[PDB]
Symmetry: C3
Subunit: 288 residues, 3 copies
Amino acid sequence: MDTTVPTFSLAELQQGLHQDEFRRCLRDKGLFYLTDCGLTDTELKSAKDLVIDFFEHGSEAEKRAVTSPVPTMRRGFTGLTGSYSDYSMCYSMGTADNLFPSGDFERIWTQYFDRQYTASRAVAREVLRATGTEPDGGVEAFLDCEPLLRFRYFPQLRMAPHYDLSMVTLIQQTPCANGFVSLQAEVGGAFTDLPYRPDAVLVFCGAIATLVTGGQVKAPRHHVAAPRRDQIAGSSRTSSVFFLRPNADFTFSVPLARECGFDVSLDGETATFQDWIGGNYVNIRRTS
Amino acid sequence: MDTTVPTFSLAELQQGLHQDEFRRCLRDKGLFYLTDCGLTDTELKSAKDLVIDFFEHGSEAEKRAVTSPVPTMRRGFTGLTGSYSDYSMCYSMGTADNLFPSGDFERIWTQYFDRQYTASRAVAREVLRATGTEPDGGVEAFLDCEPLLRFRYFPQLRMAPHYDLSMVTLIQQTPCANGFVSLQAEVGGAFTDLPYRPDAVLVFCGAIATLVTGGQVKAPRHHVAAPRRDQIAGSSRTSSVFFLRPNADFTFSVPLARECGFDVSLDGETATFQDWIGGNYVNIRRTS
Amino acid sequence: MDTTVPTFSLAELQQGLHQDEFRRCLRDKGLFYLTDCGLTDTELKSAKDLVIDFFEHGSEAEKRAVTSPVPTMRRGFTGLTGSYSDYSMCYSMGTADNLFPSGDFERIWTQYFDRQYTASRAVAREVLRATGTEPDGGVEAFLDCEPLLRFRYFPQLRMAPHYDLSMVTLIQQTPCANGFVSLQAEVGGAFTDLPYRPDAVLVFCGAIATLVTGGQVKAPRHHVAAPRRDQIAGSSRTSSVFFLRPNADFTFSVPLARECGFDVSLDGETATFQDWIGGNYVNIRRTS
Ligand SMILES: CC1(C)S[C@@H]2[C@H](NC(=O)[C@@H](N)c3ccccc3)C(=O)N2[C@H]1C(=O)O
Ligand SMILES: CC1(C)S[C@@H]2[C@H](NC(=O)[C@@H](N)c3ccccc3)C(=O)N2[C@H]1C(=O)O
Ligand SMILES: CC1(C)S[C@@H]2[C@H](NC(=O)[C@@H](N)c3ccccc3)C(=O)N2[C@H]1C(=O)O
Ligand SMILES: [Fe+2]
Ligand SMILES: [Fe+2]
Ligand SMILES: [Fe+2]
């Protein structure tokens, strides 16, 4: 195996190009960079700009006003002697129930969310087409789902190894000033760098892609590294992480789940996502 | 915001005093000290006395006889080369299925439990009244619930940051001989000391208060710190932690849950506590 | 209490010998070594031989071909700059859906699995008989279940303290060249060594034995230690861990569960294993 993380143009895939390369990428790697999907650096920088201003310059009171009463990191702001936000701050959003610091932030972030949600649906549609997969209930009902967007600022592991439990996850990063590459994934049994690319988004396949396709798609393990010390000046970083997550009522075959590695304890022949994961979303999982 | 942790007299709240102060405390802080609730230092010391004697002087055989066959810390004693109890010992009780080292311990601990359970119900009734909340099924059925009391001796973080998943949690501590203040909570985005007060109990609102009230009550994050070394002589401590926990069949609105931050994966319009958390109680949660 | 970990011959127990000793062992310890159960060192070495050859000498491509697309450690190979397998490698199997590196490996490992599954059922039948226990639905339907076998190579804690959630767990180890004893369990409130025995398998009772027997069987806590440094040359080791796990539909009394320490949040009077643990198997649990 070439252990190179590939790149695909969404526009080209949608035109039927690179069918074998894409399908083998999904089976053997389960991650790739995606160009030509409507996600520019320019917009990343505009959404990034307005939230970073809020993180640095918003007051305790303004933060409070967009903090959920339970600290779940589902919507709004999460700071996370001193503060939980010493380590990192988060801003989360979905298709509704959002908490916005102002009308300007709302306009920018709604647009950014919608662009990520469209791209995510679109790449997912290609993963399903590439694998000949018709979800129970059909493709469009499956993709009209329960996305979660989290943007996270890290001051100068960071994140332990895990796989995602999404259909797909779209990641936009900003680079470390000092060049350190924090995001890593297992490819060919070894940890491969996943650097910022100004022209592309990183796609990880998650365990729901494995499930829905009957095991035709790998859900790779990945983690976020921390610098040496030679590299701990200018080591701060941000990431925009978009989880395309199924509806609670997403239904699948139990015997099929078993065949691809899922250690289910489910009686009978079909089950729902809620049956499997329970009554709260679980976005990530460790192999341990 | 004043980030002072307030104190309320339960007797005064029950007479309708400090309505605005209490309601704003619940919304903006979700914790407070409570006086005038039937919980003296004297009784803490009497229950504390008899269990500490058991911890230090009870034999392996006497410990065994009040240890559950599965090490869940639900009832009885939990020790928790050498032993799991090197780090800490626990004594747990509920409204039934209790394991008591003797008739004297049973009398003292039953009375102590009942006083904490009454106070917990009583403060919870005030939180519900303050927020205009009628639980599905009514107030009294909601409060006749599944409490758990755990008393824990810590030898000289200790507890990672979390919020509780109770309606309310009542905490009585004994101080460190050397003055160190181990319990901390986020208030105004910063870690505030929560010291022993001889005349008062500390109340944390938990995520069930947030849920049942439709988001009118904050569930604060809190953690237990460890000394410096200048403060690691005389750093042992004890805490009595009373979780007022809903019945499995406690029913709530799914859309309402979503509106206040709960990242539910629940199909349809109502759900039960068992639907949400699953078939075992989960007492605490991290934001991570 | 004698805190010696006892040994029983399965053949003798099946003939009705040592009834009191066995029953008191289950109640007070919940672990023992088992001889005369069809599990030789010779076979351990033959299954061990062929998998260790695969771990050291199988290629990336051959590993890939027996790796599940989701990294669950349910079937096949789990490696677990550099690799997740730097720390340890795993090989997992069940009664079906297995992934085998070759016809020779398959023959050897199928036979090894079957021998462990037979021994596990057989010792479990004795635990149930010793405690006068008839599972809902009868003994044989209960024991025709969902086993999982994991073989794990550890290079030179390792495993945090936990109890198992199996009916029983059978452990075959190979020793450290340097004599260090990694596996430890709580017996008499203290950590007792559990060394390799060439003629015997180690049996841990799990929480399902506690549950099904109404609390007549202890589920002990255990952990895997790491050497000093004087003992970190020749500290690598392997273990074969067989979990005899109930069917999803295993049914028990909720009030009875409560009586023995299980902190269930289950409405009504009976429940299933799936109700209690959820839709994925959970093999181990910490007291924390
Ligand atoms: C590696 C990842 C793709 S998944 C991981 C992590 N996951 C989350 O925050 C997610 N659990 C979350 C969303 C909303 C509320 C609570 C929590 C995240 O972000 N990391 C991404 C990254 O580092 O690139
Ligand atoms: C911060 C807290 C209010 S909640 C936290 C912790 N929680 C538990 O022990 C509880 N999970 C438990 C009860 C019974 C059986 C198993 C476990 C506890 O005690 N700490 C309190 C404290 O330190 O003041
Ligand atoms: C102490 C133990 C008896 S249980 C513990 C651990 N558990 C597992 O690997 C098990 N969770 C597993 C099986 C399959 C897929 C995912 C995970 C294991 O192995 N250790 C044994 C040991 O060290 O002797
Ligand atoms: Fe991830
Ligand atoms: Fe707590
Ligand atoms: Fe174990």
